[PDB]
Amino acid sequence: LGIPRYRPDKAETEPQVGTAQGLAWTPVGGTLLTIEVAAVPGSGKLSLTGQLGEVMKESAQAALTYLRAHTQ
């Protein structure tokens, strides 16, 4: 066959800073949505890339709202 196109076990890559291995069911087979979020000092707002929906932004807002209750 040649070269393994994919990692044998996913437990071998690395822990990453802004990586969260999501879960989803794409009608072409399940796959993990590697949602990547980067924090940059500045004005303070939500930059919304990667073709979010309304609900996706609301989920981000909900996560920030909970994280604001407990920050320290």
Partner 1 sequence: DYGLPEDFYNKVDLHVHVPDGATPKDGPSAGITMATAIASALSRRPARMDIAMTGEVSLRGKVMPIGGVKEK
Could you list the residues known to form a binding site for Mg(2+), using ranges.
Answer: 23
How far apart are CB 52 and partner 1 at their closest, in Å? 15
Backbone phi, psi, residue 11, to 5°:
-85, 20
61 binds partner 1 (CB under 8 A): yes
Q: Output b/e per residue, 27-50; b: 16+ Cβ within 10 A.
A: eeeeeeeeeeeeeeeeeeeeeeee
16 binds partner 1 (CB under 8 A): no
How far apart are CB 65 and partner 1 at their closest, in Å? 5
Residue with tokens 């303070």: 44
Residues lying near partner 1 in the complex (CB under 8 A) are found at 54, 58, 61-62, 65, 68
